[PDB]
Structure 1
Amino acid sequence: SSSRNGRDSAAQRLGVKRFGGQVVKAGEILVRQRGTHFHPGVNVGRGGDDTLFALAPGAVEFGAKRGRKTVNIVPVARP
Structure 2
Amino acid sequence: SSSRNGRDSAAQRLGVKRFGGQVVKAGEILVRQRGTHFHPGVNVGRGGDDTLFALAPGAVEFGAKRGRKTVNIVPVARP
TM (normalized to structure 1)? 0.96
Cα RMSD over matched residues? 0.7
Q: Distance in 2 between matches of 1:4 and 1:60?
A: 47
Deviation at 1:47, TM superposition (A): 0.4
Deviation at 1:64, TM superposition (A): 0.4
Deviations 1:1-34 (A, max 9, x none): 3221111111100110000011000100000000
Runs of 4+ aligned structure 1 residues displaced above 3 Å come to none
Provide the identity percentage: 100
Q: Distance in 1 between matches of 2:8 and 2:73?
A: 36
Deviations 1:33-67 (A, max 9, x none): 00000100111001000000001111011100111
Structure 1: segments with no counterpart, 5+ residues: none
Structure 2: segments with no counterpart, 5+ residues: none
TM (normalized to structure 2)? 0.96
Q: Distance in 1 between matches of 2:4 and 2:61?
A: 46
In the other structure, the counterpart of 1:57 is 57
SS, match of residue 77 in structure 1: coil
In the other structure, the counterpart of 1:32 is 32
Q: Distance in 2 between matches of 1:2 and 1:11?
A: 27
